[PDB]
Design a protein around this ligand. Structure first.
Ligand SMILES: Cc1cc2c3c(c1C)C(C)(C)CC=[N+]3c1c([nH]c(=O)[nH]c1=O)N2C[C@H](O)[C@H](O)[C@H](O)COP(=O)(O)O
Ligand SMILES: Cc1cc2c3c(c1C)C(C)(C)CC=[N+]3c1c([nH]c(=O)[nH]c1=O)N2C[C@H](O)[C@H](O)[C@H](O)COP(=O)(O)O
Ligand SMILES: [K+]
Ligand SMILES: [K+]
Ligand SMILES: [K+]
Ligand SMILES: [K+]
Ligand SMILES: [Mn+2]
Ligand SMILES: [Mn+2]
Lengths: 498, 498
């Protein structure tokens, strides 16, 4: 099976890329596996495959850390994300985000039901598993539980059957047969959970699939629109119908090659302690436990020699930056374009801890609008900050066509030099805020509202007659022949890709 | 003579450090020398010494580019600044800024007058030089003149003789015997020029010395207090009285080992076209010429085989970042401490294009103040933004003790995650603004007023009971033994200073 359609094949691809370290000696899931993974993420090293995890039993489980993190080289920096999507390993961020957006104007390709698959090779009924006896990692020393769920896909369906959502949301072990996790507005797992709670008749049929097709975990991390079934979006993106199999204990369908599947219910009534967790902005607040959603597990099925992927998330750079930030930025780019805003590109700079998105403006189109900064900022912020795709983003930075938004140093330069504090910004207090950012949920104001801003780093003539400066840099302050002469004589005079 | 006390010895030090490239073939001062230097600054390469400059005649002049720019290695990154100050080349930024501040609580050591020095080896009277016939560089293609003065020291004295100021301010060739340049408030050259204009009797006696003692050019770039003679501050910093010689045509005193000295007057009445220039924030605005101060040159004296230092300034990283930003930050740290504010460290992040200063707070002292963010922000901004040392800085970022302000990634992380836009900031519109920042002089509001902000990236408990988080990073989320085990087994398991 191709790497983008089968997690086991993806692990083989990373090996053949010389992008894997297999660790065949015993590793402790209590902090050690996550510490190694954390170090990998902070240094852009090879992904670790823990083949000998202390507490593994009867095939549950090996761990792959850092499945969507960065490579050290600039030329294949995003190669692990490219390997989720059948793209060359040298793919740019623009190419990855275009691939993720490509299905937005295609007919869905609905999934195909097959009678069996590798995920059925082994099973444990309700009398045969205990989630407290599996080698579930403790990821950060102060975590409030063992977070089994950092890179699996939750599967829930609307009561009327018309929408099946796939998404990533954290969850930890509560007891032998329950998890607790985050289920918060405006996320689709929360929107579906509210539909079942208003109906009021039963708990939500649920499955959680680990080690799913890589293209599916990408879509699971992306804010594609309300009501859109991720499986058909991934089908259209990849050009192929995904093969799914029915759960044993409910009527949901899981990817045939899933490494591990939990089947059960998400309660419409019960909660349990959840968190704290070391989160995407780089913090944990010890002891900060709150009631979260409660999941009951009725059955586990799994592949022979099953592999659990794990995100050891926190400070730069991991899946919570490469996938959450970039995929939200992609969706925001499309949302702006569909609202007739002249945005060509969007990216969440890693330097902002993916709390900003930089929006590259087609300034020829802006000039034809005959508008002003105050009006344009307000229009952009109203579109983005009133939409789910803007939920996690607190600062939008508007930049002109000379800035590559995929280059954080250039965004920082533009922000710092082109946006006058206060005057060139519009604050938004009456929008949904992202409580996970420390300055929101642990800050001075309302955890769930406000704290957002549009920062206009367009210069005044970009709205009127055009750019009126040249950069004071090698590229722009010297003619072409002279630049080429300098480059051609560089090593000769005495000075210093893959 | 020691490197910190003699520019010629400093050039020899860079050679012996393997930090110089000598370029003995002909190089054009029309853009080529500056293009090479620009490339050096953008890549942290070795400093270029142009020994064969097209248009040199009778010893005027060779050029040294990038005299205060960065080295490539992390371990001696600041080595060229250390070599200005007799510090080891591995000196930290904290150590360099402490050395620059050390004289602030010492008695001055006034200079010593000597009868001659190397700067008298050659002379040209008013009938013998023409500034348009020297190999003065064109530094950026769109510059409004040939900027002879990018790394020399202007020397002017108060009418009453009690204060002699040394400072760097740009100047370009106007005609055979005049320069034009920037002389703007609140700079000391401007404050002295205003004293002479109010007296109203004569033009300002002036000298401009190029290739001065490195320790002197550092002080020339620092906002030491009003009324303080830089020569006695440098004397105290270095522990030695500087040797100076009298000018031939006026009663000012110049460093004995200066490479090149211009003697003349700064007009109290005349102006001439000045600029545009590719400036420290990374921009040039073509055609943006304005009237500037006008200097008359009456005499040139120079060393045999004189060397002119040159800053090819613009985008990161050059002297306008390493010295302007860092030295202003140093002075702001001291100013805050003298106003009883609990600041331990200050630095202007390069990522902010040295428009921000991050202020590290001693949060134990903050807690004892029993204050709030709104009150503390206002107090800090009032102290800094009402003082000359805060002139060039538009955003102050307050951070707690866990942040190393000399590390831009950590400042960016703190800013992005701990400061709620709007609520955790105070805007300052009624303070002097720095018109050179594009969003000021080419922006939407008043060029000379406002546009400043204090951004509080202290978390709420830092004012009350103490830090309530741990970072989700390798350092803080794992115990010491486990970290050491991971590090000790790193290369063994298969993973990857001077
Ligand atoms: C890649 C990724 C995405 C996480 C995520 C993680 C990763 C690795 C974790 C598990 C390591 C840390 C926490 N995560 C959560 C999360 N969204 C959310 O609501 N709760 C979370 O707990 N997300 C983001 C979420 O997947 C995106 O917002 C999707 O757009 C949600 O899908 P939906 O649009 O269908 O609701
Ligand atoms: C290192 C350095 C400092 C420049 C500078 C440059 C460099 C290389 C240039 C020449 C390349 C670009 C422009 N410069 C100017 C400048 N200050 C100013 O008023 N006008 C300027 O034209 N400065 C800053 C100035 O030297 C500091 O603000 C000093 O504190 C001024 O001394 P003072 O406190 O005694 O007034
Ligand atoms: K999704
Ligand atoms: K602007
Ligand atoms: K000075
Ligand atoms: K704050
Ligand atoms: Mn969805
Ligand atoms: Mn001064």
């Amino acid at each position: 099976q191709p790497a983008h359609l089968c997690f086991r094949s993806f692990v083989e691809a990373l090996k053949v890329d010389n992008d894997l370290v297999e660790i065949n000696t015993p590793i402790d899931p209590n902090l050690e596996a996550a510490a190694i993974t954390r170090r990998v993420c902070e240094t852009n090293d090879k992904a670790p495959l823990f083949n000998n995890l202390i507490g593994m039993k009867n095939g549950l489980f090996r761990i792959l850390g850092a499945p969507g993190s960065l490579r050290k080289s600039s030329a294949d920096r995003y190669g692990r994300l490219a390997r989720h999507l059948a793209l060359p390993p040298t793919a740019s961020m623009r190419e990855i985000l275009d691939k993720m957006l490509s299905a937005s104007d295609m007919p869905p390709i609905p999934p195909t039901i097959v009678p069996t698959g590798p995920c059925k090779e082994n099973s444990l009924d309700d009398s045969e598993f205990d989630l407290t006896e599996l080698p579930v990692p403790l990821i950060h020393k102060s975590d409030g539980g063992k977070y089994i769920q950092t890179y699996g896909m939750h599967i829930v369906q609307s009561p009327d059957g018309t929408w099946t959502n796939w998404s990533i949301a954290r969850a930890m072990v509560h007891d032998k047969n329950h998890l607790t996790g985050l289920v918060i507005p405006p996320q689709h797992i929360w929107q579906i959970h509210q539909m079942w709670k208003k109906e009021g008749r039963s708990d939500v049929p649920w499955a959680l699939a680990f080690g799913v097709p890589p293209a599916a975990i990408m879509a699971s991390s992306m804010p594609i629109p309300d009501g859109v079934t991720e499986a058909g979006y991934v089908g259209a993106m990849t050009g192929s119908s995904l093969e799914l199999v029915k759960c044993d204990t409910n009527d949901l369908y899981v990817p045939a090659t899933s490494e591990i599947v939990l089947e059960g219910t998400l309660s419409i009534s019960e909660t349990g302690p959840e968190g704290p967790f070391g989160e995407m902005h780089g913090y944990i607040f010890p002891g900060d436990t709150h009631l979260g959603a409660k999941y009951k597990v009725n059955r586990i099925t799994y592949r022979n020699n099953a592999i659990m992927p794990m995100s050891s998330c926190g400070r730069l750079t991991d899946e919570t930056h490469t996938m959450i930030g970039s995929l939200a930025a992609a969706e925001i780019r499309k949302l702006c374009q569909q609202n007739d805003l002249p945005i060509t590109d969007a990216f969440a700079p890693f330097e902002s801890q993916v709390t900003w998105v930089a929006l590259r403006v087609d300034t020829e189109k802006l000039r034809a609008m005959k508008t002003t900064s105050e009006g344009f900022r307000k229009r952009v912020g109203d579109v983005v900050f009133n939409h789910k795709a803007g939920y996690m983003i607190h600062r939008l930075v508007l930049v002109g066509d000379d800035i590559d938004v995929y280059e954080g140093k250039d965004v920082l330069w533009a922000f710092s030099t082109r946006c006058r504090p206060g005057m060139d910004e519009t604050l938004f207090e009456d929008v949904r805020g992202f409580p996970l950012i420390p300055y929101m949920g642990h800050g001075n104001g309302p955890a769930h509202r406000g704290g957002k801003v549009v920062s206009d780093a367009l210069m005044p003539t970009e709205y009127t007659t055009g750019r009126n400066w040249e950069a004071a840099d090698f590229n722009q302050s010297y003619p072409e022949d002279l630049k080429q002469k300098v480059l051609d004589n560089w090593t000769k005079m005495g000075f210093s890709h893959h």
